Amino acid sequence: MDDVYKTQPVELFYPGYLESRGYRIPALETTKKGTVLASIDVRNNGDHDAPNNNIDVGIRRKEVNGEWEEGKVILDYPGKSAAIDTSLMSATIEENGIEKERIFLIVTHFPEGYGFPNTEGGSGYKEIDGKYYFILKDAQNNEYTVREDGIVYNSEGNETDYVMKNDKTLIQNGEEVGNALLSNSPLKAVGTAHIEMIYSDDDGNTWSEPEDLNPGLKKEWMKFFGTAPGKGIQIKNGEHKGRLVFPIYYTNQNNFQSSAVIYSDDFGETWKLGESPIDTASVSSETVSSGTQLTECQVVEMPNGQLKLFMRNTGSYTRIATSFDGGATWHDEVPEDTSLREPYCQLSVINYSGKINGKDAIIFSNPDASSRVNGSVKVGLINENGTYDNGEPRYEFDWIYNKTVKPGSFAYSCLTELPDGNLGLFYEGEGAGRMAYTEFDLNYLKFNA
């Protein structure tokens, strides 16, 4: 205790804050300017997942040597159309002679009446030539496409008297007749999972309008397709320096869940979908229908740029996948780590910028139990141990520290490194829909009660 740092937990979001009855799914990221960003599900109708819940994106900022600022809703869809599970990423690009910083946020989006349990398949788009067009359905399940200037075309390629604005509002004869995201609209969007993206150029003050990442990225055979909540990373070393890496997961036609990442090499302008660790020489994540499912995940980078994907799964212990091509593919051996008991809950893992006992290190946090209790933060030392049959080296984890930071209820959490080398933790567990945040140092993790 004598030399340890640990702040008493504070509530950043709670029932009633921003008029919301519920809050869930914490995400935490630090900017290059030292600002801490805390995004959350603004679950206005209660703690339940989609569907039947008006969920929005909220965020709070804490600049270096400053207080937590007021929370703001930065993405809000009509009715009970949900924006659920957010992920944050601070990333930079060498501009003219200025290294400029942009903050990325991706979130899963459902139209009204839909969520993970009842999602349909498809991207929500139809491809004509090389252009993807937003699909709309009438009550008779006929198909329409939104094209130039928002004009709605029918299945025969002829124009209707409908226009859809970018916020999915439907105009007919100069009158607003509905919104494509609502259960009561004459023309509805496909009831399927989207990943939407927003970005901020001013250290998190203001955010762009959502950009749908589905077209050309989500496979038509996918049903669920959504953000793995927490954070993404920008690769710092190796062949793929600068690549943005965002953990996601999806389901195929058998509703089997598979983890993956989407990545960008043009600073978020375009995105590509990498393989799942489910995808091997033997197994295809498109057609698999049995075995261990891999769902929510987080990614950390090795000293040479090698990627490690930590995955929530239907097994007892955390699964870790290894990528040699910046997340495009994963080594076909995906082992457990018997030091990371995994009771089917989201986890957090991050890179640590400084050496710990002369080694590069990562930090891990999850409920270390057979249920969502005993929130524990672990420190992993990185050790080389030979190379692969290929040329790339082999990294292993030494879990030296394993500190309980929440003996009672503990669910979703997200770590981040503070500008001073300390650690922040945005976690569920304090009860009554309260989203808690605490700070501590490495000595707090070394202490063994």
Task: Give the residue numbers marked as catalytic.
Answer: 49, 296, 412
Which residue in 97, 99, 96, 122 sits closest to 111, CA to CA? 122
Using an 8 Å Cβ cutoff, are 339 and 318 in contact?
no
Residue 108 contact, options Cl ion, ligand SIA, none, Cβ 5-8 Å cut-off depending on partner type: ligand SIA
Q: Are 89 and 233 in contact (CB under 8 A)?
A: yes
Report residue 175 as tokens: 């009158």
SS3 335: coil
Are the C-beta atoms of 320 and 380 separated by less than 8 Å? no
Helices (H) and strands (E) counted in the chain, each on its own, are 1, 34
Residue 237 beta carbon to ligand SIA: minimum distance, rounded to whole angstroms? 31
Q: How far is the CB of 85 from ligand SIA (least distance, A)?
A: 5
Q: Is 329 in the site for Cl ion (CB under 5 A)?
A: no
Nearer to Cl ion, 23 or 116 (CB): 23
Q: Which of 29, 112, 275, 296 binds ligand SIA (CB under 6 A)?
A: 296
Question: Does 431 participate in binding Cl ion (rule CB under 5 A)?
Answer: yes
- Helix, strand, or coil (residue 67): coil
Count residues contacting ligand SIA (CB under 6 A)? 10
Contact between 1 and Cl ion per CB under 5 A: no
How buried is residue 4: exposed, middle or buried, by Cβ count under 10 Å (0-12/13-18/19+)? middle
DSSP code per residue over 193-255 = -EEEEEEESSTTSS----EE--TTTS-TT-S-EEE-SEE-EE--SSTTTT-EEEEEEEE-TT-
Which of residues 55, 84, 379, 414 is near ligand SIA by CB under 6 A? 84
Instruction: State in angstroms the smallest separation of the CB of 7 from ligand SIA.
Output: 26
Cα angle 54, 56, 59; round to 5: 150
Minimal distance, residue 226 CB to ligand SIA, in Å = 5
Distance CA 333, CA 2 (A): 43
Query: Contacts with Cl ion: how many residues (CB under 5 A)?
Result: 4
Q: Is the dihedral angle over the CA atoms 356, 357, 361, 363 positive or is it negative?
A: negative
At closest approach, how far in Å is the CB of 110 from Cl ion? 24
Six-digit token string for 97:
């002679």
404: contact with Cl ion by CB under 5 A: yes
Which of residues 284 and 404 has its CB atom nearest to Cl ion in the complex?
404
Q: Is 49 in the site for ligand SIA (CB under 6 A)?
A: yes
Instruction: Lay out the site mask for ligand SIA across 199-238 (x = CB under 6 A, - = otherwise).
Output: ---------------------------x------------
- Distance from C-alpha of 118 to C-alpha of 125, rounded to nearest angstrom: 19
Nearest CB to ligand SIA, comparing residues 132 and 310: 310
**Binding to ligand SIA by residue 330, rule CB under 6 A?**
no
Q: Which stretch binds ligand SIA (CB under 6 A): 108-116, 159-167, 264-272, 437-445?
A: 108-116
Interface with ligand SIA (CB under 6 A), residue from 30, 108, 376, 438:
108
Q: Is 449 in the site for Cl ion (CB under 5 A)?
A: yes
Residue 404 binding target from ligand SIA, Cl ion, none, CB below 5 to 8 Å by type: Cl ion
Choice from 295, 313, 365, 413 touching ligand SIA (CB under 6 A): 295
Shortest distance in whole angstroms from residue 10 CB to Cl ion: 17
> Is 85 among the residues that bind ligand SIA (CB under 6 A)?
yes
* Closest by Cα among 221, 302, 235 to 265: 235
Q: Does 298 bind ligand SIA (CB under 6 A)?
A: no
Under rule CB under 5 A, residue 402 binds Cl ion: no
DSSP of 369-412, one letter per residue? SSSSEEEEEEEEEEEEEEE-SSSSEEEEEEEEEEEEEEEEE---
137 vs 403: CA distance, rounded Å: 52
20 makes contact with ligand SIA (CB under 6 A): no
CA angle 138, 142, 143 (to 5 degrees): 95
Q: Which is nearer to ligand SIA, 250 or 437 (CB)?
A: 250
- Judged by CB under 6 A, which of 116, 207, 267, 271 binds ligand SIA? 116
Stretch near Cl ion under the rule CB under 5 A, chosen from 76-84, 138-146, 307-315, 432-440: 432-440
**Long-range contacts, stretch 161-166, CB < 8 angstroms, 24+ apart:** 162/187, 164/134, 164/136, 166/209
CB neighbour class for 147 (10 Å; exposed up to 12, middle 13-18, buried from 19): middle
148's tokens: 């130039």
Residues 353-392 as x/- pattern, contact with Cl ion by CB under 5 A:
----------------------------------------
- Give me the residues that bind Cl ion (CB under 5 A), please: 404, 431-432, 449
- Give me the residues that bind ligand SIA (CB under 6 A), please: 25, 49, 84-85, 108, 115-116, 226, 295-296
